Amino acid sequence: TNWLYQHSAACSRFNSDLFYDRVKVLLVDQQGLRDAYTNILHIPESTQSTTVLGWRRSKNDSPSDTSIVYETVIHDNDLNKPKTGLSEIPKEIYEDVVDEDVLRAITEQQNFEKCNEY
Amino acid sequence: EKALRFLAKQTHPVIIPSFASWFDISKIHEIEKRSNPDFFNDSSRFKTPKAYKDTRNFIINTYRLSPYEYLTITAVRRNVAMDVASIVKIHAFLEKWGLINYQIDPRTKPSLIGPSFTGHFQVVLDTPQGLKPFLP
Amino acid sequence: NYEQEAQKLEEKALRFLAKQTHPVIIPSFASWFDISKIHEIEKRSNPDFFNDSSRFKTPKAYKDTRNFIINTYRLSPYEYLTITAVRRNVAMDVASIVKIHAFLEKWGLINYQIDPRTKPSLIGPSFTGHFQVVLDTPQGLKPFLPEFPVNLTIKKNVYDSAQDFNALQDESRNSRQI
Amino acid sequence: NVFQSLPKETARGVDDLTRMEMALLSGIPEEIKWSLKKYLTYSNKAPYMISLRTLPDLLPLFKTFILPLERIVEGLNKSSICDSKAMDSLQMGLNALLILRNLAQDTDSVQILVKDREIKSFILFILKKFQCVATGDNKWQLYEGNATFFNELTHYTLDLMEAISSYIAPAMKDDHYFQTLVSILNYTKDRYMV
Amino acid sequence: NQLIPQAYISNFHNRLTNEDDGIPIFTMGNAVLPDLQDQHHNPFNILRYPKIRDTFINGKVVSPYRLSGEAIMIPITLDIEHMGHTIKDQFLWNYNDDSISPEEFASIYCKDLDMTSATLQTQIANIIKEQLKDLENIAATEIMSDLHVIINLTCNLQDRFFEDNFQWNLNDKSLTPERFATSIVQDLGLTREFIPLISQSLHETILKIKKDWVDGHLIQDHVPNDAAFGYLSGIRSNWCPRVEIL
Amino acid sequence: ENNGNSVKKNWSDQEMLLLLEGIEMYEDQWEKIADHVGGHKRVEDCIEKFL
Amino acid sequence: LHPRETLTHYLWSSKQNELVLQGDQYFNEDAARTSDIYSNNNNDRSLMGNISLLYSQGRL
Amino acid sequence: PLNWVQGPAIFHMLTSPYTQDEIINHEMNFLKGRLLELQEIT
Amino acid sequence: KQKSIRQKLINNVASQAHHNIPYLRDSPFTAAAQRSVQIRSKVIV
């Protein structure tokens, strides 16, 4: 006895040790790194907003206006459901499942992920 | 005989979504049978279904100690005597179907180190008669 | 509690924003290019990534090495980027990465020889218009929320004309007036 | 100290030759219109610059707007051109046809166009469509609103036939060109065409 | 006016020979780069950083250079000493593709290092042709019968030697070894310099196992080492990766 | 006055007077006309205001 | 013979012909001597956009 | 081989007529202004 | 004085009127005319 709990605790403390090691190097102490070949500051891709959607047009309030308003906006679908992608699954996989509520939920999550655009 | 003592002592309560109701913690069925047939349809002598059951139980039991942290591949690989070509195919399976990476602290999932993203930078056009902006 | 998390997300978005200091000049024929999607011209110029002949030539890795060279070129626009400077950072074959770098140099996206001081400017699009770029929440700066369709504008900016839009001026000439 | 030795021959961007060469390879339609208009200008002002003998990679670039014109010619009998896209392809095709006509009287860019076995097939197609107008058959009745899209079209094909007429001097018995043009001659009323 | 141009700065070899950056090619607020802090859209504010004003001062003027069913990845090593310093690097090569010549890539590689000695372009390419001739029938194998080998893998980068031990199955072609190389770097938090190095150290071990399978025909599929939890049911892994500072 | 004015395209009486003074001085060379207003007005903008 | 693609052809071609015939209206005698061309007509878009181009060529 | 050469003098007149008789009278003046300037080179 | 600048502006933005205005350059008569005025003369033999 006391084998599987010891191995699982070793796995959990190893994952926690790696999580405590990499974030102090990347984000806490000097906030990034420096490339040796080019003048590019190394930064993790997790804080970079890897996707971009289409353009949005509007109009100013005053007529005969010459000001150009260029800016950014952040959009997300409710910020609660995760990005566990069910969209990389062909439609012939989940056909012999035992329930119908899971057939509702998988298609709901696939529509949630295919409605990433506004 | 072995996981019953492990599941009772230091196991955090299970958070399961609605699209993960097909998952069975005891045995397997036709969804997990058809996804990775290399464990079943005589691919090798080492990819036995009992070792497959041991790994698919060990990963979902290793996640129960830290539900809010990202379960990496290497931390599973430290105490699993299986090929990494199968460890990745099971870890990506459980991440795709939303079991071991559903509700964690999202700053725990690592990404690739590199440059920043250029999506909001102002880029102009080289017109042969001017320098008109690119504003569609 | 919701507005406090929105203000924290706006503060960390101001922390990780990668502000612009130098302009990027692309030619007029290179207007078909987009960051996210892969165009049919890129699909037909290098058919080895899309015919699925080899395993080391995937469209995901092709999009990654397409974005990497362009990000490392646009973060430092004044530097002439070479093949050796990006070879030691990405793990791909030479006979295809030279094709990719020659594609990006041939179509004028990177390594473009221009001196913009001797060319006049024009006003192409309309004057009015709120040109806002739509980004997504990065996985890693999301709130914890132990158990929200609110948008946030990070940097507000105005321009008097396109000639100061080309020179990255944000009407700060009230401070540095002659 | 480094911004004082810039070469002035390439500090204005890339030159107009490769700019207009990449303009037709791009997908921007106003840029393609500008490139075809400037190539129509260069074909009148200096035909030796854009000749096929000097630039070998120029002959597939102009065929991509002339070869899909056959669908418009087959659809020319009725009002098939509805939007501003089929008209745009029509204008690009008739511009590139006149560019290749202006590149066909230079005694060096002619033999390669004779060796090209597809431009002559387009010429044969236009002559077979014009033979119905020259004869009076019921097939492919010409639309009167689209007669101005064809009267100025057939002259640029007859000019290319006049250009390639010297290199098809070995003629056969069942020659479609000699069968078509003798019926063209008995119908037309244009002095220049006769 | 008052616009900085797009090109004509190639201060790269002086940073290769700067003797402070982690480059193994040549031997002889508080942020360093303002990629997260604004400069109020003024150019002069970039001159306060020493890693950027050195690029503005010590720059130079160059000229722009103008230029199959299954890929065979062969790692190519290089070790040539010339005028005091050495050249030590490694790069993969597609044996199936023949679009670029090794003479042409050696000319590009000597143009990038700012040497132009007109003999290293032949000296590198002769070693490239020699290794591609000696390794022309070693990576086109048809490996079956479920070897399930063990791999001790080492990475050599500036007294920071990376070491790991894993059991690999070189029979199935599902997992990409480049994906395996970058998955270790994403977890451990290393830089992008190990991204070529781990895969180029892995393909050499793969071709060594292919040499053992072809030249000697040794099967040696006899009890690979486990921890009695995975494959072998002894009592019911091997090691862990680490970065040692030597 | 000699201080800085308000936001652009307001065109107070001083800025309207100095441009019509400079046109009667030079009649061409708009680089020498834009600085007579005070320098804070563009060459491309003073022509658009005068027209 | 066809009732569909000739009425959309009419609604396109007659609209383009009306846009061509309504393309010469701001260049009359008493229309150019007034000030309702230059002032506040940013919706016109034909003129008042090439003053940065004609000044760079010396045409004035 | 690459040789940066000056392009030919293209007669781009400001007004753009369509009749032939309003083009030749300026084209002859363009030829007289072009050939007398390129004659002194050779 | 401003009338001379207006005459130099209007007779330079309206003398062409078929290269920047889209609906006048997308006309069947104007496009055919601009194409047909660039016809190079045919040589004999």
- The two three-digit tokens of residue E52, written as one number: 């950027």
CA atoms of A88 and A102, how far apart (whole Å): 17
Chain I positions in Cβ-Cβ contact with residue F51 (cut-off 8 Å): 2, 5-6, 9
Q: How many CB atoms lie within 10 A of CB F27?
A: 10
Cβ–Cβ below 8 Å for C134 and A56: yes
Closest CA to C128 of G44, A59, A63, G49: A59
Q: Which of G6, G7, G19 to mutate to test the interface with D (most CBs of D within 10 A)?
A: G6
At B91, phi and psi to the nearest 5?
-70, -40
Instruction: Please identify among residues 4-23 of chain I the ones whose CB lies closer than 8 Å to any CB of chain D.
Output: none
Indicate contact of G with A: 3+ CB pairs under 8 A: yes
Indicate contact of E with I: 3+ CB pairs under 8 A: no
- The two three-digit tokens of residue D102, written as one number: 């202006």
C47 part of contact set with chain B, CB < 8 Å: no
Pairing of strands B123-126, C24-27: parallel
- Give this entry's resolution in angstroms: 7.1
Chain H positions in Cβ-Cβ contact with residue D9 (cut-off 8 Å): 4
State chain F's maximal CA–CA distance in angstroms: 27
Closest CA to B71 of A14, A87, A89, E175: A14
Inter-axis angle of helices A4-23 and E177-188, nearest 10: 80
H14 part of contact set with chain I, CB < 8 Å: yes
Contacts of F25 (CB under 8 A, 6+ apart): F36
DSSP C159: B
SS3 C11: helix
Q: In chain E, which residues touch A (CB < 8 A)?
A: 12, 15-16, 21-23, 30-33, 35-36, 51-52, 55, 187-189, 191-193, 229, 240
Cβ–Cβ below 8 Å for D5 and E61: yes
D190 part of contact set with chain G, CB < 8 Å: no
At I44, phi and psi to the nearest 5?
-110, 120
G42 part of contact set with chain A, CB < 8 Å: yes
CA atoms of C129 and C133, how far apart (whole Å): 12
Q: Which helix (H) or strand (E) holds G32?
A: helix G29-32
Residue D143: beta bridge partners? none
Chain G positions in Cβ-Cβ contact with residue F47 (cut-off 8 Å): 51, 55
I5 part of contact set with chain G, CB < 8 Å: yes
CA atoms of E239 and B81, how far apart (whole Å): 10
Q: State how far residue D101 is from chain E, nearest Cα, in angstroms.
A: 32
- The two three-digit tokens of residue C143, written as one number: 């709130």
Nearest-by-CA chain I residue for H19:
I37
Closest CA to A97 of A108, A84, A88, A106: A106
Q: State how far residue B81 is from chain E, nearest Cα, in angstroms.
A: 4
Q: How many domains does chain A divide into?
A: 1
B116 part of contact set with chain C, CB < 8 Å: yes
Nearest-by-CA chain I residue for H22:
I37
Q: State how far residue B83 is from chain C, nearest Cα, in angstroms.
A: 19
Q: How many CB atoms lie within 10 A of CB E87?
A: 20
For H19: left if phi > 0, alpha if psi spans -120 to 50, otherwise beta; the answer is beta
C-alpha angle G36-G39-G43 in degrees, rounded to nearest 5: 90
G22 part of contact set with chain C, CB < 8 Å: no
Which of H16, H18, H23 minimises the CB distance to I16?
Answer: H16
CA atoms of B102 and B67, how far apart (whole Å): 9
G52 part of contact set with chain F, CB < 8 Å: yes
Nearest-by-CA chain D residue for I44:
D105
- The two three-digit tokens of residue G50, written as one number: 């090439």
I22 part of contact set with chain G, CB < 8 Å: no
Alpha carbon distances (Å) from D182 to D129, D142, D154, D168, D194? 15, 21, 15, 16, 11
Closest CA to C23 of E36, B134, A109, B80: B134
- Cα separation of the two ends of chain C: 47
At C135, phi and psi to the nearest 5?
-110, 175
- Neighbours of G, requiring at least 3 CB pairs below 8 Å, are A, B, C, D, F, I
Alpha carbon distances (Å) from E26 to A40, C135, E200? 20, 41, 20
CA atoms of B70 and D125, how far apart (whole Å): 67
Q: How many CB atoms lie within 10 A of CB C138?
A: 24
Please give the torsion angle defined by the CA atoms of residues C164, C169, C173 and C178, in that order, rounded to the nearest 10 degrees. Answer: -70
CA atoms of C34 and C63, how far apart (whole Å): 11
Which of G38, G51, G60 minimises the CB distance to F44?
Answer: G51
Sign of CA dihedral D44, D47, D49, D55: positive
Q: How many CB pairs under 8 A join D and I?
A: 33
> Which runs of E-coded beta strand occur in A1-118?
43-44, 52-56, 69-74
Print the domain residue range for A69: 1-118
Residue E75: beta bridge partners? E92
Mark out the alpha helices in chain B (DSSP H runs). 3-9, 30-35, 49-62, 73-77, 84-96
Q: How many CB pairs under 8 A join F and I?
A: 9
Cβ–Cβ below 8 Å for B81 and E232: yes
CA atoms of C31 and C34, how far apart (whole Å): 8
Alpha carbon distances (Å) from E239 to B74, B76, E225? 11, 12, 10
C-alpha angle F29-F30-F36 in degrees, rounded to nearest 5: 110
I9 part of contact set with chain F, CB < 8 Å: yes
DSSP C152: B
A64 part of contact set with chain G, CB < 8 Å: yes
Cβ–Cβ below 8 Å for F44 and C174: no
CA atoms of F37 and F28, how far apart (whole Å): 15
I2 part of contact set with chain F, CB < 8 Å: yes
Q: How many CB pairs under 8 A join D and E?
A: 14
> Which runs of E-coded beta strand occur in chain E?
73-81, 86-94, 149-155, 162-168, 242-243
SS3 C37: coil
Nearest-by-CA chain F residue for C173:
F40
Closest CA to C57 of C85, C107, C88, C99: C99
CA atoms of D19 and C107, how far apart (whole Å): 10
Alpha carbon distances (Å) from E199 to A35, E91, E189? 20, 10, 17
Contact in structure between E170 and A4 (CB atoms under 8 Å)? no
Cβ–Cβ below 8 Å for C112 and E34: no
Give the type of residue at I5: I
Please tell me the total number of residues recorded for chain B in this structure. 136
User: Which residue's structure tokens are 């994403």?
Assistant: E186
Contacts of C121 (CB under 8 A, 6+ apart): B130, B131, B132, C162, C163, C166, G52
Which of B38, B73, B81 minimises the CB distance to E187?
Answer: B73
Q: How many CB atoms lie within 10 A of CB B20?
A: 17
Distance of CA E3 to the CA centre of its chain: 37
Mark out the alpha helices in chain D (DSSP H runs). 16-25, 29-45, 59-63, 69-74, 86-102, 111-115, 119-135, 148-164, 176-185
